[PDB]
Amino acid sequence: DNMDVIGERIKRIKEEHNSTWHYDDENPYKTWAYHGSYEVKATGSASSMINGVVKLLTKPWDVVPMVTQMAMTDTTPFGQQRVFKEKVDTRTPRPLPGTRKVMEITAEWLWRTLGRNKRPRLCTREEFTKKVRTNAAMQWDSAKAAVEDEEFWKLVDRERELHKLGKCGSCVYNMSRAIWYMWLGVRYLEFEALGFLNEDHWFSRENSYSGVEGEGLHKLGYILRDISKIPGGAMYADDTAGWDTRITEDDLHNEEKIIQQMDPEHRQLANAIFKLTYQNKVVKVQRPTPTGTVMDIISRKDQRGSGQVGTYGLNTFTNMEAQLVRQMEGEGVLTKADLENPHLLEKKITQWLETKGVERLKRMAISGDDCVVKPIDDRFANALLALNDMGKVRKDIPQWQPSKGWHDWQQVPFCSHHFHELIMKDGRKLVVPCRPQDELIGRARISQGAGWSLRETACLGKAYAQMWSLMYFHRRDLRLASNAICSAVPVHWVPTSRTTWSIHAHHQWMTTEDMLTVWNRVWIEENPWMEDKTPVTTWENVPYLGKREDQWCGSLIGLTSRATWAQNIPTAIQQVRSLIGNEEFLDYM
């Protein structure tokens, strides 16, 4: 089918592992082309490492089911195969000809709108090097060593010369030093050709209208509140089932239209990324066999490779396009007859885009596969023909059952959170991010690496605690647990690793600066929705959620076990201090 594009990559893998290369007839691949297997040592673990510092200071959550579940993520070849079979080995039916036509018209208009002020450009070796260096001082260490080796860049140049001839020899996606250099080299080449979407803020709210890039978790609630003021129907936030697996060959060709705005030298490189690694891909996946573990080499023409970071911007683009198409259907612009029609009237779609498209983009908050839409009316709730036909089937709901919208922006699911408007004691309002408290505690109790010292583990606990003090201060249990962790860890110990990989995280908690000072900077000084810049001088003036809402959202406040924990927390803090040693601590309780 496509061996002329993927053949050189498979030939190189096969030559490198010819001692154990074989065709396994028991391969479970149904929708992916299977090329072969070779022996590998199994990677991953059946369960996550536990952060003992966070665990010792959150004893009431030792029982809680969601907390116990989050520590059971299986990353072994058995776990990889399970996820692959249940989620990735699917085929999306091809959209109808009228659906493909409206998508193409909308994609061309959207790219033109997105590129009205900005022009695409190539990203560079020093840009990638700087990003890698700033992230290593938060594998990043391995990546920092690779960017400092001139042989890595000479390998990058050889692969770029193949891409310029329309060939690919080593850009393989993963579901010795040489293979790590080839993977990081593939990521560099992708960054060089498509990194501009992220680096130049193409999906910022000012540039894209719907986008939220660069806003930060602390600003998303304010944007949903601003959207709530636009006249129209309810706010809809439908979750797509496995968004990345529903990116069709038609979606990929619509995303590729951005190459039309590039300079010749950039278009050549971006066309190679689109054709060789996005629209044709070679993937490695581990699989357990009766006699050991193999690495399977598979390929397909559609879906995304999640590891690519160019996928965030392209997912945002395709979601903005799909939601505009759904809004057109709700408004009666797109009928069932149009979706089936190759010959639909292009001009009525163009006219709707040119007269109402930007206004309709302003009614949305879109981040990758996450969307919030406030349509002009509720007909949108039942406009499902185009959405299902485009392959974006909603998760856990019958295909034709109407979407449920929200009339309170505070109840809307966006980027794994919901948002509350709080009234401070001085009358000022704050709009804060929130999620089930068991998820926040469960995540903070997971360590990220093996062989970590008590220092590295305590510093990751401190990073989680400071993130809670800045984003989730309004949750009573989290402010208390945060104070306990910060009192148990040396004040000069710098938080390490990362609390989240989310694009919305700005990592203001990765500091040894006083958290109240940082809180003031984020919530008051730099908050554009805070008109009165009066600083808050004490945590007693930093508000909480309403007790009832805190309890509805997972708080243990009012339980006897929680009261016992709060009363005995100086004892647990002292136990952690005793094991850390004679360092400088501070009492935050």
Residue span binding Zn ion (CB under 5 A) among the ranges 104-112, 307-315, 516-524, 548-556 = 548-556
| Contact status, residue 481 vs residue 57, Cβ threshold 8 Å | yes
What is the chain's alpha carbon radius of gyration, rounded to the nearest angstrom?
25
**Residues that constitute the known binding site for Zn(2+):** 159, 163, 168, 171, 418, 434, 553
CA separation, residue 30 to residues 85, 86, 88, 277, 407 (Å): 9, 12, 10, 21, 43
CA separation, residue 32 to residues 15, 28, 89, 194, 277 (Å): 22, 10, 7, 26, 15
Burial zone of 26 (CB within 10 Å; 0-12 exposed, 13-18 middle, 19+ buried): exposed
256 counts as binding ligand V0M under rule CB under 6 A: no
Residue 171 binding target from ligand V0M, Zn ion, none, CB below 5 to 8 Å by type = Zn ion
| Contact status, residue 331 vs residue 378, Cβ threshold 8 Å | no
The 67-96 site mask, x for binding ligand V0M (CB under 6 A), equals ------------------------------
Among 32, 61, 109, 128, binds ligand V0M (CB under 6 A): 128
Spatial neighbors of 441 by CB under 8 A, at least 6 apart, are 54, 58, 61, 64, 67, 477, 478, 481
- Residues 300 to 339 in contact with ligand V0M, rule: CB under 6 A: 309-310, 312
Nearer to ligand V0M, 23 or 501 (CB): 501
Measure the CA angle with vertex 163, ends 157 and 167; round to 5°.
125
Among 48, 103, 190, 243, binds ligand V0M (CB under 6 A): 190
How many residues make up the chain in this entry? 589
| Contact status, residue 499 vs residue 469, Cβ threshold 8 Å | no
Residue 553 binding target from ligand V0M, Zn ion, none, CB below 5 to 8 Å by type = Zn ion
Among 64, 553, 566, 580, binds Zn ion (CB under 5 A): 553
- Residues 418 to 447 in contact with Zn ion, rule: CB under 5 A: 434
131 counts as binding ligand V0M under rule CB under 6 A: yes
122 counts as binding Zn ion under rule CB under 5 A: no
Residue span binding ligand V0M (CB under 6 A) among the ranges 186-194, 440-448, 456-464, 491-499 = 186-194
Among 98, 185, 195, 391, binds ligand V0M (CB under 6 A): 195
Q: Quote the least distance from Cβ 342 to Zn ion, whole Å.
A: 35
503 counts as binding ligand V0M under rule CB under 6 A: yes
Which stretches of 229-272 are DSSP H helices?
Answer: 249-255, 264-272
136 counts as binding ligand V0M under rule CB under 6 A: no
Spatial neighbors of 526 by CB under 8 A, at least 6 apart, are none
163 counts as binding ligand V0M under rule CB under 6 A: no
Among 57, 147, 168, 372, binds Zn ion (CB under 5 A): 168
Burial zone of 538 (CB within 10 Å; 0-12 exposed, 13-18 middle, 19+ buried): exposed
Tell which residue, 160, 173, 253, 180, has the closest CA to residue 9.
Answer: 173
Applying CB under 6 A, which residues contact ligand V0M? 128, 131-132, 135, 187, 190-191, 194-195, 198, 309-310, 312, 501, 503
